[PDB]
Amino acid sequence: DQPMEEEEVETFAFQAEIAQLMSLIINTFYSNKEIFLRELISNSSDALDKIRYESLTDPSKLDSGKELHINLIPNKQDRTLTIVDTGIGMTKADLINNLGTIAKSGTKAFMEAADISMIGQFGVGFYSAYLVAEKVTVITKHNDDEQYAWESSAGGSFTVRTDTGEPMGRGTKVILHLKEDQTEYLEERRIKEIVKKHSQFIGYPITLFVEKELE
Ligand SMILES: CCNC(=O)[C@H]1c2ccccc2CN1C(=O)c1cc(Cl)c(O)cc1O
Q1: By the number of CB atoms within 10 A of the CB, which of 52, 103, 131, 159 ranks highest?
Q2: Which domain CATH number covers 211?
Q3: Is the CB–ligand 1 distance for residue 43 below 6 Å?
């Protein structure tokens, strides 16, 4: 038989510091792990600013969707928390450069420094995900390009491939498969309080969708 699907998959090694960093974040104990959701919402907001500011000069840039927002989708059945935004998105190359193989100065500094919530300033805030996730999947779609999937369980490497899933119009989808002991962030009350405490100044709509598959 012919496969329902077949696509090339590429594996990349993380730059050495970023990898050392992820182990740091994974194995060590930290107390305000909740700041991961702020870091990821924060990434979404900047992505939303870029598409927004580009549309000002080139209105067709929004042909792939006018609405600028962030959705938070807890799914207790999958034990996943997904952050979805309709920002500018990422090309395949962006995924490879910006999410693993290029380091940046803050990396060596940060590992050595202190409270974990500093990670936002050192520029590598994405990786705070692995405070609560054992695996992170990033689905992204940039205008005029394919939809891509970035994936990592933080073993020193990550994978990129074309995404066969459900088509996004534009933007980025981050899928946190949470550690067994971090399921609290699937909770509406907990999500609401983290957002109110750390993401109060985000100038885009933030909407929760509690997901439950029915029998
Ligand atoms: C990876 C580095 N890019 C960004 O943070 C933002 C960003 C920031 C400034 C300009 C363009 C873009 C595109 N991004 C994304 O597609 C994205 C990435 C992650 Cl990891 C996330 O959680 C949410 C996201 O919307």
Answers
A1: 131
A2: 3.30.565.10
A3: yes
